[PDB]
Design a protein around this ligand. Structure first.
Ligand SMILES: [Ca+2]
Ligand SMILES: [Ca+2]
Lengths: 25, 253, 108, 235, 261, 253, 261, 59, 25
């Protein structure tokens, strides 16, 4: 995992359901 | 049985569901890690954060729906409206309680959704931006009035079709939004607690409408054995953790 | 037998004339080609009770629900939504009952 | 210099590849990331939300709100009320949240939740049989042929909704989104179990339906969606 | 990975794990262990092609241009092409860096100039504003290589607005602009050729990376009519006297009869 | 001397070879690491796993061969056939016992092979898929009937040439498959135990035929000094570790 | 490596290691130590060019296409070319990732679009469906490089069917499809040129890698007639009145006399 | 940059070479590998099976 | 042995007779 351009924007692609499907109290 | 008290007001219910907490987050205050403007924001906390009940709309047969933009609907509702007109920016969570009760002889349903950034479509045709006056109707809301080819197009009228949510996206997929259904067989009310949803910490409360409460009669109102053909729907909206900064002259005319 | 296009919703204007149209449906003839009994399809029941929805016969196996004007639709008073049920039944006899939900609009 | 080689696939622009690229505007500090509520990391979490099936898509009701429900009544004999073919390319499922997520992917594997709600008054009761015919089986056209599959029987009272979990029954490991005869998903059929008995003689009920994904549902082979067209130029 | 199927025998319960309620606004927790008798199944399946970084990070075409007199001009927006616009309008707010690949069939020597907002772009080739000291510019030959550069998140906010329910001006104004048109402009790319040889077609393939999607929305069920506008009433014929009719252009297909499919 | 007992049945032999175990694996049940469908599969285990003997075919002079598709041949054989018609999927190993005995005065040979996925060729000519009815003949099998230019081609008839194994691959290379030879000089029977061979854990037992037992008279039947010119061949197939899942209505007509 | 030859002297045994039986379906264990008197021989020979990864992983031509009007279309299958089809039909099930190299004699700028199954491919060049947001596409210039991409195992099963003894539809159906035609489709590749200069011939060289072969089959001893069809009766002349005759097209040669070769 | 050289046999497409290639469809999870009986790893194991010689190939 | 594309499918070529030739019991 090398960053060939020395920048964070210059990199490649980077890497819970319950806020939907159960948004209850 | 349920009770929701925010100061100088109280909501009580009898046949009520679980309260919906929108996207799992309660309304909070703006943290210092998430703030941009330098001045100290105001915090009314008891006279703005209270249940303001808007005008009742009448659920008849053939009613296609209603919508209220927020925080546009509370622009003349108390010191929340006065603080909105006197400040450059503001953020607020909301607690939206929708009330419609008829009987054990009535039938019907109401999908009560809260849409963040409901960019409404034009009523139809040419490349025309919709009007400021038509997306800011106040506490009166906007009766959706149904789709037709004969709808008025004068001056950026908004879209009138409830099936496409008046922005082109299908109803029934509206349940991706914080919603509840008022089915008159089972419940009569629907409480939705929404935090401040925006990609910015505070913005101008008159230019930008963050939320948009949308009520659609999914199934029509059958009266049954009872001569009552139309039942009122009342919308009680309470700001919660509302704050305002950048005080200035009143932005009225 | 099947009633084509009936689970459906019709729409009548408020002060509609006697003879106006409120839904156009059909009937598929059950792959035996036994035709409909000429008194049928009827309306057995309505939801509150109702006359003036009489089912008419268009040209072919296509039918139509038509207000006959024996009862006036008055939206400012009730009732504004009816659920008529339409009862096709053929010569050998295999019935099909299907609902037409009829709404009344507001002419103003 | 150091001996290198440029094999095939070096000077090619693949769209779906993962490469690093030189940052135009260096020294650019982006605006800060605040906590915005509702952050979604996986579109399956959109697919797992209940969304209404347009179960009445007939040629009059499309374009209207009344395509989302069917009307039931008191009948003497058992009738097949509703058939949902278990296809993610069928317009019943493909217009929902689950189907419009799964229409981006060429394959799918998992279980479907289908939740039926009857909107009627508080006195109308009824029992319905909701049967899932597994793949390879004909559409039943008899309740005795439908009760031999994956079914549930739900009563009506004090809660209007009931969920049938359409389980993952398949020969292969993944099912095709565009439905064919080799990987067809089967059918879901709604029947009258005992009746629908309203408090009047001509009373009615309005059955809706929502669909979502189970937690064990997976997708692969991301493709174009057939649920989007462009025939004119957007200017 | 997805959860495995748990074994379930016959159950006689008094709390039904299949009677729910649609009205509460919460989806079901129902697994296949509630309805039937299941077996254990080792599920190694992933949804790693369904996360936002893999769903959106694919390098879609954002805009096409044609060099007229050795010159093209394209303002950066995901709004001209409907297939990437639908995938972006799945969500409300999106924060992404974007890498921009230019596929041109011109043969020769081309120049791209990323004009940042707030200045005059070059109105033609051979213009004086191509000679710039601070505007970032890309020279390339389209034979032997496609150019590619990452534009980072230039937002004026924590995210880009896919939808905006607001206006840029106050209530009394007349040139008010609904939508996401004033909220963010990603600059523009000015194309020119310093040679003459090849074709004129320039395609701009933009890949969103480091994506953070913030509020989910319904997928669009109608064809787009304009850009920055979210309309969907297509006005097909302007000339003939069926002019004021408006098609819908949705994707809901019809079936001949329910309970027969 | 040999004895093979699977419940409610028993195979006994006197002049028998080593039993062939196809590809070194016994028929097993579907493990949870190799399963895809979620429901619990059924296990008959005593009334489906039993020796079903099909009809006897007559090895005359000029008989080119016979083939039985599996599990198509057992479609009307007992509760294995009933469980196949009532379930969406199924997997099964098989134990195929082939019996042909004549005398010490007879001559002849029979290559008895078990072909996985015997995709049969068309009987000849144009691009025509072979019929469902002709590759699913039941327990009667299909007498191979020999190659000729005058063979019927009506409706996707299968290929009739035993030398090309009726899919284009040469006989004599058929020994790459699980096979045994019934040479009447030395043995009279041939037992082949086949596991479930498929690249999928379970599939529909009516659409897909996994195995195909093929018996070819390699050397013709000389009667010798004895007036018997034709000797019957009986095929006794037993399912083993058969399981079915996805129960549904009967898939008949 | 192969086993060495062991030394064997004269043996007078009563268990013969050379009388076997063909009828048991097992091949012989007979080494040259059974028949003759052998010496020790160090055998360093390998069969490392005979395993499935080296037998099949060679980059065979799978399909040819010709651009008609700046457009070609090829559905991915190993069935048009007989030499790779024979090597695949050595086995019944094959699980392999495949890398796809495109050898085109066109000069200019080409586009490949791998259309996954279940959607409409672009029916021409300049079509709207070339502008896609999610279909994986490859732009390349054929001068200075051949394009190459790995399609992983897209199977819907644990392996691809080289042979299928089944049908996709039940018994009562009429458009039934025998063979491996419905069991798996590997998508298709849509070719177009954005220039005009060079030739039209596109060759698709596909290399199976990470191969796992599952059930051995006899090598085919007849020429293929169709694809997805496993027929071998070649119908040579359709016009003339010898039409209904069918050649065999096998490779078994004849000798004039046995016991004289 | 780092001094490199491209000797002969660099920009060549040999069919029988062994190279790595960019995965189209990234994030693709293949279907699981089950135990199918009879797995063959070397075609000599096919060559070691007794197969009938057509010893009477006359015309 | 480097994987230049960080994928298992992106790699190069990877690496008992008695199930045949003696399939007895
Ligand atoms: Ca009136
Ligand atoms: Ca009125």
């Amino acid at each position: 995992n090398i960053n060939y351009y020395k920048d964070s924007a210059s990199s490649g692609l980077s890497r819970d359901p319950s806020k939907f499907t159960q948004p209850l109290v | 049985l349920k009770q929701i008290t925010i100061g100088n007001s109280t909501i009580t219910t009898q046949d009520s569901l679980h309260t919906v907490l929108a996207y799992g987050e309660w309304p909070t205050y703006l943290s210092d890690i998430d703030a941009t403007s330098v001045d100290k924001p105001t915090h009314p906390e008891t006279s703005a954060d209270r249940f303001y009940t808007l005008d009742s709309v009448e659920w008849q047969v053939g009613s296609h729906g209603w919508w209220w933009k927020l925080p546009d609907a509370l622009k003349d509702m108390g010191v929340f409206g006065q603080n909105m007109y006197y400040h450059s920016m503001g953020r607020s969570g909301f607690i939206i309680h929708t009330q419609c009760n008829a009987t054990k002889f009535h039938s019907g349903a109401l999908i009560v959704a809260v849409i963040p950034e409901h960019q409404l479509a034009y009523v139809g045709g040419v490349k025309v931006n919709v009007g400021y006056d038509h997306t800011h109707p106040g506490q009166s809301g906007h009766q959706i009035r149904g789709p037709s080819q004969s709808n008025d197009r004068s001056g950026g009228k908004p879209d009138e079709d409830p099936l496409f949510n008046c922005n082109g996206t299908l109803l029934g997929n509206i349940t991706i939004f914080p919603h509840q259904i008022i089915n008159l067989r089972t419940n009569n009310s629907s409480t939705i607690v929404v935090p401040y949803i925006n990609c910015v910490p505070m913005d101008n409360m008159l230019k930008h409408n963050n939320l948009s409460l949308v009520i659609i009669p999914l199934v029509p109102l059958r009266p049954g054995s009872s001569g009552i053909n139309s039942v009122p729907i009342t919308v009680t909206i309470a700001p919660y953790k509302s704050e305002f900064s950048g005080a200035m002259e009143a932005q009225r005319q | 037998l099947h009633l084509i296009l009936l689970p459906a919703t019709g729409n009548v204007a408020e002060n509609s004339p006697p003879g106006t149209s409120v839904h156009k449906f059909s009937v598929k003839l059950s792959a035996s080609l036994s035709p409909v009994i000429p008194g049928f399809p009827q309306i057995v029941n309505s939801n509150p009770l109702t006359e003036a929805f009489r089912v008419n016969w268009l040209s072919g196996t296509y039918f139509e629900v038509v207000t006959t004007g024996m009862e006036q639709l008055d939206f400012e008073t009730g009732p504004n939504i009816f659920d008529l049920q339409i009862y096709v039944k053929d010569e050998v006899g295999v019935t099909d009952l299907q609902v037409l939900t009829v709404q009344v609009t507001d002419v103003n | 210099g150091l001996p290198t080689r440029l094999p095939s696939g070096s000077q090619q622009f693949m769209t779906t590849e993962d490469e690093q690229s030189p940052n135009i505007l260096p020294g650019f500090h982006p605006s800060k990331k605040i906590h915005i509520p509702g952050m979604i990391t996986n579109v399956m979490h959109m697919a797992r939300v209940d969304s209404f099936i347009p179960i009445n898509n007939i040629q009059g009701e499309v374009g209207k709100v009344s395509m989302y429900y069917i009307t039931v009544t008191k009948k003497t004999v058992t009738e097949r009320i509703l058939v949902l073919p278990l296809e993610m390319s069928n317009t019943l499922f493909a217009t929902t949240l689950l189907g419009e997520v799964l229409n981006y992917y060429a394959n799918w594997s998992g279980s479907i939740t289908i939740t039926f709600m009857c909107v009627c008054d508080a006195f109308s009761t009824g029992k319905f049989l909701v049967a899932y015919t597994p793949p390879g089986g004909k559409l039943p056209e008899d309740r005795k042929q439908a009760m031999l599959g994956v079914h549930i029987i739900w009563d009506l009272g004090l809660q209007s909704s009931c969920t049938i979990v359409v389980p993952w029954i398949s020969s292969g490991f993944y099912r095709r989104t565009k439905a064919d005869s080799f990987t067809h998903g089967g059918y879901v059929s709604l029947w009258y179990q005992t009746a629908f008995v309203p408090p009047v003689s001509g009373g009615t009920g309005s059955i809706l339906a929502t669909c979502s994904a189970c937690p064990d549902m997976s997708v692969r082979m991301l493709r174009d969606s057939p649920m989007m067209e462009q025939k004119n130029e957007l200017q | 990975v997805v959860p495995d199927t748990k074994p379930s025998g016959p159950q006689h319960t008094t709390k039904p794990s299949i009677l729910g309620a649609m009205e509460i606004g919460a989806s079901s927790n129902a697994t296949p262990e509630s309805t039937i008798e299941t077996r254990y199944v080792y599920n190694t399946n992933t949804n790693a092609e369904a996360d936002v970084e893999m769903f959106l990070g694919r390098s879609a075409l954002w805009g096409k241009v044609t060099l007229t007199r050795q010159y093209a001009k394209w303002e950066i927006n995901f709004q001209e092409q409907a297939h990437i616009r639908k995938k972006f309008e799945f969500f409300t707010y999106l924060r992404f860096d974007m890498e921009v690949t230019i596929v041109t069939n011109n043969k020769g020597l081309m120049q791209i100039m990323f004009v940042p907002p707030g200045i005059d772009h070059p109105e033609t080739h051979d213009d004086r504003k191509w000679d710039s000291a601070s505007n970032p510019s890309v020279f390339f030959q389209p034979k032997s290589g496609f150019p590619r550069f990452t534009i980072p998140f230039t937002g004026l906010a924590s995210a880009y607005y896919m939808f905006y329910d607001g206006y840029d001006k106050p209530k009394g104004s007349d040139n008010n602009e609904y939508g996401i048109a004033p909220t963010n402009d990603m600059g523009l790319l000015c194309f020119r050729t310093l040679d003459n040889s090849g074709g004129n077609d320039v395609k701009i393939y933009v890949k969103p990376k480091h994506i953070t999607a913030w509020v989910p929305r319904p997928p669009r069920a109608t064809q787009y009519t304009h850009k920055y506008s979210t309309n969907y009433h297509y006005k097909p014929n302007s000339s003939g006297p069926d002019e004021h009719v408006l098609k819908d252009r949705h994707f809901i297909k019809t079936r001949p009869l329910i309970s027969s499919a």
